[model samples]
Target: QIDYRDVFIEFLTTFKGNNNQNKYIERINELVAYRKKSLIIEFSDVLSFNENLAYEIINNTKIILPILEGALYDHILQLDPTYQRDIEKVHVRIVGIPRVIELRKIRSTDIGKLITIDGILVKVTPVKERIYKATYKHIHPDCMQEFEWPEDEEMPEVLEMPTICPKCGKPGQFRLIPEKTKLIDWQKAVIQERPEEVPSGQLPRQLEIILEDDLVDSARPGDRVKVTGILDIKQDSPVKRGSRAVFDIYMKVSSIEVSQKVLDEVIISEEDEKKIKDLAKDPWIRDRIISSIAPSIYGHWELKEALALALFGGVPKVLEDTRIRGDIHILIIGDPGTAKSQMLQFISRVAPRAVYTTGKGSTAAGLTAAVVREKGTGEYYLEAGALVLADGGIAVIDEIDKMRDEDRVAIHEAMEQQTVSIAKAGIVAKLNARAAVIAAGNPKFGRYISERPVSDNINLPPTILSRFDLIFILKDQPGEQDRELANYILDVHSGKSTKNIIDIDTLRKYIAYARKYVTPKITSEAKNLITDFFVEMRKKSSETPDSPILITPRQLEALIRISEAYAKMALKAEVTREDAERAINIMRLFLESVG
Candidate 1:
């Protein structure tokens, strides 16, 4: 029963004599003079004046909006004589005020209110036209009259009985017009809660949002967006033989603002920053991080080091001619019971945002992106898959050898280009998949053949193999170390090996801190070392034509990336010679083991 019109006028009057008010007056005058329908107003300005003004505008939009427009018109008339002339038919509409809200907190009480919700857009439907206005004509020979019918919902399959012709005063003389209503752009999208918002061991909640007009095609899969709209509901089909109606809720979007916060939001306080700085000062920081990964596992020190580097990736580079991806892809081919799965599980948990899946259970679409049709509406939508959903994080794929060869081929683009291109179901879109992949697989024969090449033992093709920054072969060779490893595993299982150089939570925080702040650039010394190493390796390969090619430009890029990651782990701004040496040492060890 509260008077919202008075409230809106009071709020608008407070902005009088200000520069912003002058701009608003000018914009309103321009809209009225040009016979434009919509008057654009900043939602932030409304909230800045008074929060209740925004709520009042939404709650009584139908009546208050017209009053607000009338007030603007009066102000325009007072401004100049020209603005007051020839504007009799002009009617302006105010776009509803924006309010930011969380997806999970939206409720029935908030229905019909304009609000904004921020989340990752995981699915988007293609833009299509919906009927907004329809036309009908009289069929009487003596009298001709046309009528317009405005429709808000879908037209019926069967036509209703035509209305009597008013001109002829006769029934059954009206005819449906050949022309139809004007069509407007319509689209639908689904947004999922961010990883950080989802509680542990629970799937993220999702909400559907309807987009129209200018809001269509505003976002794609993997995009983080803040969508402003009104909460709406539609009746659901009855499920049982005797049942009451059900309702499905969605948002009617007005505007969309895309954000680039892909990684989980990390809050670094001053104390945490100081602690991180202290840890970076330790000479054994790298070893401590490597040991922190899967502490229960015995020892794969080199592999763990590589995994640690992969977690804190290098700086992404975009040049005039090329775009270099910062994410590092690692592949581990090992014998069974070698702790590959354990390593992958640990990495998935520690990474700020990650997705874990087995290759045997995943398809090309499941791992990348898929086009699915809504059952009731038959509308097609693009859904983000594991890789796309894990954008700006990590994707841990286990049992890579169990995946089909064709399915494995789908990740090639995502691995190198960091994008998934979809041209299916009449929807063409490129989704971001800038995620590092840590894949573990068993040998083709269930056990690695020492005599066979690593590529041959693994079922992966060379094209995919070449995409990995680091390819490690973890063989279960028996030796004096077996006894030590057995003791370590038994002690860990019995809860006796409780000692850890660094806790998992601290390590995760450290990695996040380094990744969020430190972007190391290759120093002159480090660049020279890497250049020399690549030149020497290439020269050696060329000298021995019969031997297999050891390294390529891809490997050189990988070396730089690893060195940069190493520098980032130490929170250094410059990649030093030591970082380059450590990268070379790991690569050299892999090459030796594979050879």
Candidate 2:
């Protein structure tokens, strides 16, 4: 025989001498003064003797919470008489920092226990109101009595009344009243493991979450969040007579914390910072960073340089009317055997947060954002795709030409506006997608044709091609350098000693540090140079009708971004004239190669 009343009274009184008593008092005072209906208590501050006691508190929450709330209400009323009329029954909510658990690792033992989970919120449902407390009237003509149903109990579809009314001692009839005593907001969402967290070749795991009251709409799709909740099981009834004895599990969320940091999980040490600073000071820092990318494949200096700039993007700006995105989008068009896929793979590995997917296999929903329906409940939910999941990092799309026109249209807005919008299944929402794109594709023909326009050889639409900051065409031209390339390839495969540059780990750290701290602004001299170059290119395009339109306003913006990236490589605050010149030279090389 356990005395729950005594146990709960002792737990509430113990807080009087505890260190966190003042916090509880403050919270209770706020609740009373504002006439708030909820009182949140930190689980860590509660007095529990052991794990068993904590478990008991959670299991018997229905009985203990009201007792605790009543004690708190009495304490507040003693402090002030003004709150006597405004204060009513306060709902007690327990919240605290809990142990973090993976969705796949959630076991049966964890059911009903509070825990925290970290993942990307991939789906969300609209908020709806549900009746928490119901009222019913006894329909006897003489004994017209009203009764309130228990708020904690689940509401049943049908209500059954007693055969006889207690007051009248006659046959009783009951009917639901129009008035609802209490109503609470409810929402549902799904969270999936981050792409980088999933093991290679394994699909990411997902878990459903139930959000109530203040927790609803707290996080959007593609946002990384840490949710505190209790795990619970749901019975999945089969359409047929009998089925297996398994049930689905989900979380009833209590608190949600959103994180926008791309490299929040990355730990940078003092030693790594020193190494990055040292590397920045080198005279050939830009060349070294480019050389470090895909070292095994030799000699595509210009292509490598562009990829490096895409990694260290420019500063994003929010203006009065519009926003200037910092991410640099690049497209690589090449023939087969040109190491295009290898470059994309290397970038996918080096980027702090990246997703790599092939074009033919990816759908519009898979590349952007989608509204999906759950078969069990027939409820609509919004799920994030590749671009949304890669926010603040990079999205590498391989075999870009193989993608359908409709599917390719999904990325148009993402490239320019840095957002993915979805309007389907009664859900219309936009998700952040401020990620650089490095897409690789093969020409429509088996080989490149130098005689035609660059766009004519590729299967991409003109609108899509114009969005890329820089477009590089890699043609396999047989030359004297082929022998050297073959020898380098042989050396790499044979495990022979080749020219070793910066290691992959150090390069990743260097990029992360630069992106995190450095935001280079264009110096006056550099700005003047860039403006002059843009004016000159526009003049050339207007003067010679036969010459291709080599530069546009978009190209001008690209020039600024590339120069800023160049300055960031040196860890400088100002983009110098030399940086502008380097960007101009790269643009010239691109035009000359494809023109």
Candidate 3:
């Protein structure tokens, strides 16, 4: 007797995808217990039950989706009677929809059509309520002889209207009434073309996503979301598009899923693993990595070593009572022509999820999470900034001095606590931004005054300065170092001098390999050596301390992290005495030059 809507509802109620049990029935119960809105189903579910069902959904999505949504929602009222009173329009989201529309290649033909988009969410807008209007059934006065109706009488037709009562003027009466009010939760998100999916030279594209009712707050920035949605155009205001020819395309999302792996954990192949282990066995593995960092830049020997160690950082231990950060934080204040930006760019490429920004260009919201109000929509949306995007990777801010005092304060929590806490706008959530800092900036006077200490020479505050595990100052004075640096730079461009550095890909593999597998612990010898170094520093501070506070507990922790990094580089199980000595050398060098 019935066909379109009834078949789908009947298929769901008695589907054999459960192999003797009902699939969606149990899922509905699960949804009831969990108090979730959407009852997610797969394309294959209907594909097995009825062949044409899948074909119709693929081609005529707008026609079928609403019918599907209403049918799925009715059952929620069937099982959990109280549910229909709470919410309307339960989403019947379908997964594994087969076709993926690449971001850059999206076109006019693609608009208003259902397709899959696999990308990363770079920005998201706040949750807001959308006034829901009920469907009214009737026709235009121009319609003649009761104009043939669709097969599904209960289902509403697509939004098509007759022109000025102009569907062949045999007109009498055309009417319908909106008798229901609904409050649907809505939000908008922006998805960028995933970095891994794009080719090296291809420009990346991003699209704005609009979600309603059940699917508004289900996404966040930095998530690699492969979602099923209708590609549609955003309507511009009369003022914005007075005579504009082009329109902005966005997504009307129906379903969402996360598929992230490229940013955090890198792929390590069998051949790459063999090469990484073989390279780790090299006697000068640590030295090679350091020199490989900035091959063209001559000297900053300790600074390069620190950068190397930063890549394969120390192990973060979470005990029952306490947790300590294994990651290292570094700050570089140098005179002009030091290639500070170059260093930052290099690290940005080396680290998987690195975010490189500058003080002049960055805001407090740009560094961490900010709840923003959209001017047009008047809705509050959360924007996860640079640190959040660079979670478990590296965050490099070049020229930190030029930043506003207010904005500069944002990274304090990002450095010490190493996670973001954002709950100000009733949007309560803590995001893990566990990234190391490699910040570079200028001197206070814009040039190095070697006679003065770092505190006097640098414009940054004491609180910010103390958070860095190592501080290195580079001065470009006229001397033997200058001549050597100039000669090296010249030779590099001329192709006369070649560096024996590890290739970029292999280096990335090396870093990811060590960081994932190797977790070095301290030997008794290593512990005693670092302890002695810390004790000696305290003794010196007590006897004839130069500054108000010679060394804090933070410095001691810094030493431990550096030693662990040294051992981790070699894939060593323990931080040996040699590791402690090298760490001491690096730390001591920082003190002598900066102080």
Best candidate according to TM-score: 2
Runs of candidate 3 exceeding 4 Å displacement: 1-7, 10-23, 48-51, 74-83, 134-180, 195-205, 236-241, 258-307, 315-326, 335-350, 362-366, 369-384, 422-430, 443-452, 482-582
Residues 106-159 of candidate 1 have per-residue lDDT tens digits of: 767787766677877767778788654456667666666765543333354223
RMSD of each: 6.0, 5.5, 7.2
Model 3 scores a C-alpha lDDT of 0.58
lDDT of 3 by residue, 184-292 (tens): 6777777777554566545445678877777776776667678788865455453355787666876877888876454444454333443444423322233333334
- For candidate 2, the 10 contiguous residues with the lowest summed lDDT are 494-503
lDDT of 2 at 424: 66
- In order of appearance, the predictions have TM-scores of 0.76, 0.78, 0.74
Tens digits of per-residue lDDT for model 2 on 1-595?
6655555444544564355455555655566567666656667655343354456556655355556666556666677767766544555566655578877788777776667788877677777887555566668778777666444454642345455554455666766676645567888887778676787678667788888775678678667868877765565455455765676776876667797444433543333443444423222233333344433444444444544454446555666465546446666665534454454444435454566665444342356545454522543546456667777676766666766554568777777677767676555767876776777776556354454555555556566776666656655545534765685666554221222334343455345344444435444454555656654664453222344454455454544454444434434434445455555555565556446
Quantify how close model 3 is to the true structure by its C-alpha RMSD in Å.
7.2
Instruction: Order candidates by lDDT, high to low.
Output: 3, 2, 1
Model 3 residue pairs with clashes: 125-381, 126-380, 126-381
TM-score of 1: 0.76
Q: Model 1 clash pairs?
A: 133-181
